Amino acid sequence: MEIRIKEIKENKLIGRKEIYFEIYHPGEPTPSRKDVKGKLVAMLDLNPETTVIQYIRSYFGSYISKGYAKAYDSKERMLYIEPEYILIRDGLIEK
Amino acid sequence: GDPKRQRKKYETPPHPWIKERLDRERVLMDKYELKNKKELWKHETQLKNFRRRARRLLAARGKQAEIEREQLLARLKRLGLLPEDAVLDDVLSLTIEDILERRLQTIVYKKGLARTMRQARQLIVHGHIEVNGQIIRSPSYLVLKEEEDTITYARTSPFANPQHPERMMIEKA
Amino acid sequence: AIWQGRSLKKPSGGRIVLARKKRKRELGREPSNTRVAEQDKRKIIRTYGGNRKVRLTAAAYANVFDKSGKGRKVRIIRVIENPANRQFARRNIITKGAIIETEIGKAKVTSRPGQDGVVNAILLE
Amino acid sequence: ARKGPKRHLKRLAAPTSWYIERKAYKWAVRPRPGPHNMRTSIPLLYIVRDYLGYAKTAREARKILNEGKFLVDGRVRKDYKFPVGIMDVVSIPETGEHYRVLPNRIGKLILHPISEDEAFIKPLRIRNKRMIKGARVQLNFHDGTNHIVSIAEKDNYFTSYTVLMKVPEREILEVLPFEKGAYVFVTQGKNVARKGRIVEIKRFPMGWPDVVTIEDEEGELFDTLKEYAFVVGTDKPKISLP
RNA sequence: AUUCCGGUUGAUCCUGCCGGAGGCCACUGCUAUGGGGGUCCGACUAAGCCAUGCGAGUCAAGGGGGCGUCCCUUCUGGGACGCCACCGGCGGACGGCUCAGUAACACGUCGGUAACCUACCCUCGGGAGGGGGAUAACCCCGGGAAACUGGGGCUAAUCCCCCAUAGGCCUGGGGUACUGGAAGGUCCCCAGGCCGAAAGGGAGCCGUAAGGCUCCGCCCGAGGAUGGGCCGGCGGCCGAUUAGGUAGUUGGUGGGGUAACGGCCCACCAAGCCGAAGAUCGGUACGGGCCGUGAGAGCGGGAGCCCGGAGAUGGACACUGAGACACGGGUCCAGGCCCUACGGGGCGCAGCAGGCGCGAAACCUCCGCAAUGCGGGAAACCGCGACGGGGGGACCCCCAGUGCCGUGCCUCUGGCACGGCUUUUCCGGAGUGUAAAAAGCUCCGGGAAUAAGGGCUGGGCAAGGCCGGUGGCAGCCGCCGCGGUAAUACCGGCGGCCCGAGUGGUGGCCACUAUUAUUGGGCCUAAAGCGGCCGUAGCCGGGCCCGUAAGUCCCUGGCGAAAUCCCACGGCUCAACCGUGGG
């Protein structure tokens, strides 16, 4: 699986950066959220504890899976802004 | 009033049993390996809509009329039914066979990725044919001229291996 | 109550059947028969939209003006004539068209005591 | 069955001047009463979320707004139902972005970027003039705002004139009169978003509005309503309207 | 596709109707492997009746209390934050459901209100001075079967009341400063009166104090905005076996009332007003955007989505509020139910599910406020059977499957035998998806394995002169017509044809139908010229000259919401569906 970043936006009204990317993975299943987040943090040199993956969407009959994620400057702002369900899904919140 | 109801995109013959129409449609279905008569009627309706648009635009004057004429010609050329130098007169000369030739299964058979039209339909339905880098599983899809040359086996299907016995059998034809 | 809505008859002469119930906004109120008395009596009415109306039921004084802007607060004795009704003058009822008598003379009313809360009049020279 | 004011608004009945998907959802933000009409206004929530994309959900849009990070004209606005209309300046001091709200050629509202110096000017068309207590003159602008001047300056302002007003301090910069050759910009009608210079003014009996003829940069002559004609300069536009 | 075919005779040509042939909606027999998108599903008969659960709450940063924890000087009393109900503020007049009533300014459109109200919100110019009063919670005592509710003590407020001023309303005499197309309007000066405000309240940071700053707040005036009220011109259904209707009825003079004009109402004056160009009366019906059909003209429908109007078992009334004479608030009458300790006390699903009845005819007594919106709050945030998600259903559309290839056989449009191949679908699994699930999507293991029925077979109309049974009996038949011992027409067998996850039956609408005829039908003999004339309205009208632009044509501003309809492009695989532009 190869990750290619299609768009980076710097939102500072909310202290975050929005990342739109794609995963090229022919002949393989949809990558797990853990693996996607790990590779994204490794490539972008981000903080693992202040980044979330909004979604990883696999299309029909395609080897490209689209992906949307965010990276926050501060964990406090991350918790304040992001919903609880997405944090639970990403595993940041033990719940 | 009433809300919108999604109407059918194909038309049924005015008379269900006419010898000439029955024989002609039987010939077409046997040749092009269509599953049911509604596919043929859908293609006929597409043709008839094109001809109706051309007829309405021929006797129309206005800026919107010219824009629609140009758009219709461009769309037909993109579909690949008309030559690049065609005019509005050539639209009325189209036939059902022209449209039936642009079906994905027909183009697959012509390119030779399958031995027969039935095999081409099987490959399309099972996902062994890719459009661009994309897999499509609609045998009735009308391919576009701008891409017709990029149709090939999906890179993950067994038919992508020259060794595959079925691929060898297809090739030796 | 006093409904002040559409009439029940067409101008041609036919009848009209109501298609809806009476609405609270189309209701009126009983006439305020302002009478001559020894003391002023008035009440406050809350109207549509929370507005206020001052209704005079018994009137004792009157503000009389004489052709020059000068005004005097005088006492109302009796109603000489009230063309609005043939019995208002007899019953001492004050309305916008009444002609009243005061110690200074005859004065024609120019206000609406049922809507104003006061009685204003102009002397007759 | 209807007993009082409405509090909802379906997306399929939203004003045609908005840039909104009319079938993605069922409910739209009902604009709160404010400066401009509903026809030439849009709730600030849609600007924060859809137009600029700073937010993905109404919740975080409200969270952004409550921190006073969005400025309209020169005042910080926190109500997400606040209407913003034509010739309004939306400023985001944290980003340095300044936009002017203007109608495009199809009557829809769009945000045109402007400069920091321009961000402190808001033209106002004198919609009406009246008198108030103490013998003072009150001017009512196209956005519902009001100003007061002394009777000494009675003749300095007339209906259909334009006033350049610094904001949020509300100081009078200058007055652009409405005469021949005055640069104008159409804010409504079939000729919306078209600019030019005044040519002639025609009046009619009864309450029928006066009609003004305008000449565009290409020399063509068109017509519109005198109230639709918005003055923006004397010979050339004093503000950017592309 | 701007269409025809069968049927009146021994045979022919006409007029004329019936049937065949197509599309759409409702019910229904047989049958059925999937996946997507959508504005589908107790409208037709009963706007008939309902058990149970839910469908409107929010605010501790307005106020006083109670319980708990902590910090405590330490009998004192002070400070916090958790929970709790109470007063108090706002909302509950929107959203949701149904089409009864209504032939009407109810609806659509274009204009008026210079004749008017508006809580929430925006801007500008000002103000917040002095007093008073209870009462909830709490404590004591209770009753009533319940529903409910009495007495006493005690207190606070953004609770209530009063005083002052600012301010509102009327009227009279003056000046003409303002918007307007035009002032019973606005503004300025005098005169007489009536009405008549506020919470400098709360929170945070500072400051020794004083005092300061920020946030959310209160009151008056002038405008806006939102939401309305009212009014005018035009437009849209049938009956003459319904010809005269009206009597506050038409208009006026003066008043009352209304937020506002108005016979809306009152007193007084006259006889006016509507009507064969169809008043009144009667029948039916929510109006429109739109939907069905047709080459079009046109005809028919106008339940689901949007705007507007009405209703909350049938009527009539009122209180609070900006907004109601108010679906889940109140009073009474009429009808139908329920508890009762018999004294009394409650209720009406045309809200989401569910039940009874009615019927030919219509689903779960499910999960969440995560997305869109609404109310409340300074905010976080809480609530919402609105909405979002799933469940059941041959609701409408789109894309597919029930295998493919090679060889050899055959009674060759296909079945079989051998050897291969694929997994859309099927089963199991890992991820991704969802608020959580499920469905979809990528991948892995198995395997052609899990998947075709319905009508018809004389013509109209594609398909059999084949075989067994009945012998004017059973039966078939939209129409012609067939069956009487030789049935290609009935029942079945074997063949064959049309569509195909659909296919048939019944009712309705359009075309067929130039059998409603403006386009565009007929009246000598087939239906149809008054037995004949004169004339009222209406319709149709000789030639030339001049004037107006009502009709007519052209150009140009303001309109006729959105969705729906057509075209191009882009996004869900293409498509249905959505988005951006043009029409």
Three-state SS for chain D is CCCCCCCCCEHHHCCCCCCCCCCCCCECCCCCCCCCCCCCEEEHHHHHHHHCCCCCCHHHHHHHHHCCCCEECCEECCCCCCEEECCEEEEECCCCEEEEEEECCCCCEEEEECCCCHHHEEEEEEEEEEEECCCEEEEEECCCCEEEEEHHHHHHCCCCCEEEEECCCCEEEEEECCCCCCEEEECCCCCCCCEEEEEEEECCCCCCCCEEEEECCCCCEEEEECCCEEEEECCCECCCCC
Query: With contacts defined as CB-CB under 8 Å, which chain A residues touch B124?
Result: none
A11 touches D at CB < 8 Å: yes
Q: Least CB-CB distance to B136: which of A26, A27, A61?
A: A61
Tell me the angle at which helices B117-126 and B104-111 cross, rounded to the nearest 10 degrees: 120
Smallest CA–CA distance from A10 into chain D, residue:
D54
How does strand C61-65 pair with strand C120-123?
parallel
Which of A13, A80, A81 is the closest to D69 by Cβ?
A13
- Which residues fall within 8 angstroms of residue D206, CB to CB, at 6 or more apart? none
CB pairs under 8 A between A and B: 15
Q: Using the CB atoms, write b or e for B130-167: b if 16+ within 10 Å.
A: bbeeebbeebeebbeeeeeeebebbeebebeeeeeeeb
Quick check: D213 CB within 7 A of strand E? no
Residues 6+ away with beta carbon under 8 Å from A89: A33
To test the contact with chain B by mutation, choose from A2, A63, A66 the residue with the greatest count of B C-beta atoms within 10 A, namely A63
Distance CA B40, CA B29 (A): 8
**B residues 135-164 near A, CB within 8 Å?**
135-137, 155-156
The nucleotide lying nearest D26 (C-alpha to C1') is E372
Q: How many CB atoms lie within 10 A of CB B172?
A: 7
**What is the spatial distance between Cα A2 and Cα D155, in angstroms, rounded to a whole number?**
73
Show which subunits contact B, needing at least 3 CB pairs below 8 angstroms: A
Asked if residue C97 keeps its beta carbon closer than 7 A to nucleic acid strand E, the reply is: yes
D69 in reach of chain A (CB within 8 A): yes
Residues with Cβ within 8 Å of B114's Cβ and at least 6 positions away in sequence, in order, are B108, B120, B122, B123, B170
Residue A63 to residue B156, Cβ atoms within 8 A: yes
Rounded to whole angstroms, the distance from the CA of residue D108 to the C1' of nucleotide E561 is 15
Nearest CA in chain A to D63: A81
Query: Which residues of A are less than 8 Å from D63 in CB distance?
Result: 14, 80-81
Residues C45 and C23: their CA atoms lie apart, in Å, by 19
For chain C, list the contacting chains (3+ Cβ pairs, <8 Å): none
Helix B37-58 and helix B63-79, axial crossing angle in degrees, nearest 10: 140
Residue D6: count of CB within 10 angstroms of its CB: 7
Residues facing D187 on adjacent strands: none
Flag residues 95-134 of D with CB < 7 Å from strand E: 105-106, 108, 128-134
Closest residue in A to B156 (Cα) is: A27
Residue D4 CA, nucleotide E416 C1', distance (Å): 81
- D242 near D112, Cβ under 8 Å? yes
The beta-carbon neighbor of D63 closest among A9, A11, A81 is A81
Resolution of this structure in Å? 2.7
| Element (DSSP H or E) covering residue B105 | helix B104-111
**Sign of torsion, CA D35 D39 D45 D49?**
negative
